[PDB]
Design an enzyme around this catalytic site. Structure first.
Site, PDB file in Angstrom:
ATOM      1  N   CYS A   1       3.602   5.479   5.434  1.00 39.52           N
ATOM      2  CA  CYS A   1       3.732   4.270   6.221  1.00 39.52           C
ATOM      3  C   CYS A   1       5.198   3.868   6.260  1.00 39.52           C
ATOM      4  CB  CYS A   1       2.879   3.153   5.624  1.00 39.52           C
ATOM      5  SG  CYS A   1       2.897   1.629   6.571  1.00 39.52           S
TER       6      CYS A   1
ATOM      7  N   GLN B   1      -7.224  -2.845   9.644  1.00 43.19           N
ATOM      8  CA  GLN B   1      -8.420  -2.025   9.779  1.00 43.19           C
ATOM      9  C   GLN B   1      -9.445  -2.474   8.743  1.00 43.19           C
ATOM     10  OE1 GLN B   1      -5.861   1.962  10.676  1.00 43.19           O
ATOM     11  NE2 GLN B   1      -8.088   2.266  10.638  1.00 43.19           N
TER      12      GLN B   1
ATOM     13  N   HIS C   1      -5.365   5.274   1.559  1.00 45.57           N
ATOM     14  CA  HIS C   1      -4.508   4.220   1.026  1.00 45.57           C
ATOM     15  C   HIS C   1      -4.764   3.986  -0.451  1.00 45.57           C
ATOM     16  CE1 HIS C   1      -3.832   2.686   5.223  1.00 45.57           C
ATOM     17  NE2 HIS C   1      -5.046   3.182   5.370  1.00 45.57           N
TER      18      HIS C   1
ATOM     19  N   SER D   1      -6.010   5.540   9.593  1.00 44.32           N
ATOM     20  CA  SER D   1      -4.620   5.928   9.406  1.00 44.32           C
ATOM     21  C   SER D   1      -4.478   7.041   8.392  1.00 44.32           C
ATOM     22  CB  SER D   1      -3.753   4.734   8.984  1.00 44.32           C
ATOM     23  OG  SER D   1      -4.073   3.586   9.749  1.00 44.32           O
TER      24      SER D   1
ATOM     25  N   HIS E   1       0.830  -1.195   0.000  1.00 46.62           N
ATOM     26  CA  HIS E   1       0.000   0.000   0.000  1.00 46.62           C
ATOM     27  C   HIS E   1       0.864   1.243   0.000  1.00 46.62           C
ATOM     28  CE1 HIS E   1      -0.365   1.355   4.479  1.00 46.62           C
ATOM     29  NE2 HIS E   1       0.759   0.676   4.337  1.00 46.62           N
TER      30      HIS E   1
HETATM   31  O1  LIG Z   1       8.641  -0.783  10.660  1.00 37.95           O
HETATM   32  C1  LIG Z   1       9.154  -0.810   9.527  1.00 37.95           C
HETATM   33  O2  LIG Z   1      10.229  -0.242   9.239  1.00 37.95           O
HETATM   34  C2  LIG Z   1       8.422  -1.557   8.435  1.00 37.95           C
HETATM   35  C3  LIG Z   1       9.132  -2.063   7.357  1.00 37.95           C
HETATM   36  C4  LIG Z   1       8.489  -2.759   6.341  1.00 37.95           C
HETATM   37  C5  LIG Z   1       7.123  -2.940   6.378  1.00 37.95           C
HETATM   38  C6  LIG Z   1       6.385  -2.432   7.432  1.00 37.95           C
HETATM   39  C7  LIG Z   1       7.014  -1.727   8.452  1.00 37.95           C
HETATM   40  O3  LIG Z   1       6.317  -1.208   9.513  1.00 37.95           O
HETATM   41  C8  LIG Z   1       4.907  -1.091   9.264  1.00 37.95           C
HETATM   42  C9  LIG Z   1       4.376  -2.340   8.667  1.00 37.95           C
HETATM   43  O4  LIG Z   1       5.019  -2.622   7.417  1.00 37.95           O
END
Ligand SMILES: O=C(O)c1cccc2c1OCCO2
Ligand SMILES: O=C(O)c1cccc2c1OCCO2
Ligand SMILES: [Cl-]
EC number: 5.2.1.8
Length: 147
Positions: free
Chosen positions: A97, A115, A141, A138, A43
């Protein structure tokens, strides 16, 4: 008649019939083609001042309005659909994100983890399909189903 969420509509500019998905907010001219335990999605998130956490790796204080966030989302969708830019390129550069560093990839997930509007859109996308603007707490998206 049509796969989940899809409905017929009339273009206001051309008068031609198109197809709109009210779960994913996808829209397209072509009649949509043709549920798994898990899907894999990427996303691109654009946050706004009313986001649950109005902060990201791009911006300590996210101040843009929800309307401005939607315009940004709409512009990214246009560039993705024109082929001017790749989804992954735009997610890496502009997603609010932290998944931006993985080209927006969230990995695989089941129902009951994300969500709800995001989950519903993700599971209504076919593999390879992209959503329109999907609204959650959030932000807004663009969702790409990859598996
Ligand atoms: O926390 C992160 O750096 C991270 C890296 C790759 C994918 C993610 C991440 O955190 C949110 C969920 O999806
Ligand atoms: O859930 C997270 O915070 C997270 C952190 C790093 C990478 C990820 C993550 O979530 C799923 C995507 O890949
Ligand atoms: Cl901005």
């Amino acid at each position: 008649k049509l796969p989940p969420g899809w409905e017929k509509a009339m273009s206001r500019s051309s008068g031609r019939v198109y197809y709109f998905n009210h779960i994913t907010n996808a829209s397209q001219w072509e009649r949509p083609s043709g549920e798994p335990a898990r899907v894999r999605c990427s996303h691109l998130l654009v946050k706004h001042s009313q986001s649950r956490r109005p902060s990201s790796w791009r911006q300590e204080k996210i101040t843009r309005t929800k309307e401005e966030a939607l315009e940004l989302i709409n512009g990214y969708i246009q560039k993705i659909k024109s082929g001017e830019e790749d989804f992954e390129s735009l997610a890496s550069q502009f997603s609010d994100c932290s998944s931006a560093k993985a080209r927006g990839d969230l990995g695989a997930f089941s129902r009951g983890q994300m969500q709800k509007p995001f989950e519903d859109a993700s599971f209504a996308l076919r593999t390879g399909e992209m959503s329109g603007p999907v609204f959650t707490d959030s932000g807004i998206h663009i969702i790409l189903r990859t598996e």
